[PDB]
């Protein structure tokens, strides 16, 4: 008997969706996990001013390796062995 207007999810007069208990428990546990993450992310170690350049050497070496791998692009080698053994298509009982 009760008819819903155009689309029960968008528009003005829409069918309202409510909350039960599973959603509340999920929100509670997610908020607890996020509060635990906030607590564990509330303590540094080097206090910023003690890391002006401790692992920059590894980054520079990795960048040099990536550059050497990207600048070493060349077509593969071409040998005569393939062109010679391709003649074995018409091989008989030899």
């Amino acid at each position: 008997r009760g008819r819903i207007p155009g689309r029960q999810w968008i528009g003005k007069h829409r069918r309202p969706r409510f909350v039960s208990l599973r959603a509340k428990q999920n929100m509670i546990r997610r908020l607890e996990i996020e509060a635990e993450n906030h607590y564990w992310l509330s303590m540094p170690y080097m206090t910023r001013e003690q890391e002006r350049g401790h692992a920059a050497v590894r980054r520079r070496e990795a960048f040099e390796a990536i550059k050497a791998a990207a600048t070493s692009k060349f077509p593969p080698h071409r040998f005569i062995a393939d062109q010679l053994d391709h003649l074995n298509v018409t091989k008989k009982w030899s």
Partner: peptide, 25 residues
């Protein structure tokens, strides 16, 4: 699309409704 202030109450979003229902007095 409707404005921010209207007279027909305007039902909020699903996530906003869940947040308001889980954070009650």
């Amino acid at each position: 699309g409707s404005k921010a202030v209207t007279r027909h109450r305007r039902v909020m979003h699903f996530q906003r409704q869940k947040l308001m229902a889980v954070t009650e007095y």
